[PDB]
């Protein structure tokens, strides 16, 4: 599923991301735009052979099991494929664990490089929430 910007913002708000660990909703929408272009089916292989999955490009080296990242963790205890669903619940719940682990949204390289320090409220502007 490719989300619309406001559609995704509303879905993330309903799932409790707005101000989650102090990150306003715009941050999460901005991160999803640059991680996946709002596409729940996005995958990308990393150098170390791990793969990033889903709208927030959650990495199999730590967070989900894809059966092909030897010696990896599955800290969200989910198959990585669950992160590609039209229903973003699994991605959101896993993202909540990642953002809580001490490094905040810096876990998302695209957020660090393209959202952090910008006017992230712009990403939810005009949305009916
Ligand atoms: Cl915001
Ligand atoms: Cl933080
Ligand atoms: Na894994």
From Swiss-Prot:
C-type lysozyme domain location: 1-129
InterPro entries, per database record: Glyco_hydro_22, Glyco_hydro_22_CS, Glyco_hydro_22_lys, Lysozyme-like_dom_sf
Catalytic residues in the record: 35, 52
Key words of the record: Allergen, Antimicrobial, Bacteriolytic enzyme, Disulfide bond, Glycosidase, Hydrolase, Secreted, Signal
Principal location: secreted
Catalytic activity: Hydrolysis of (1->4)-beta-linkages between N-acetylmuramic acid and N-acetyl-D-glucosamine residues in a peptidoglycan and between N-acetyl-D-glucosamine residues in chitodextrins
Annotated positions binding substrate: 101
Tissue expression profile of the protein: In the egg white and polymorphonuclear leukocytes.
An example molecular function term from Gene Ontology annotations: lysozyme activity
Protein's GO biological process: cell wall macromolecule catabolic process; defense response to bacterium; defense response to Gram-negative bacterium; defense response to Gram-positive bacterium; killing of cells of another organism
Name listed for the protein in its UniProt record: Lysozyme C
Gene that this polypeptide is encoded by: LYZ
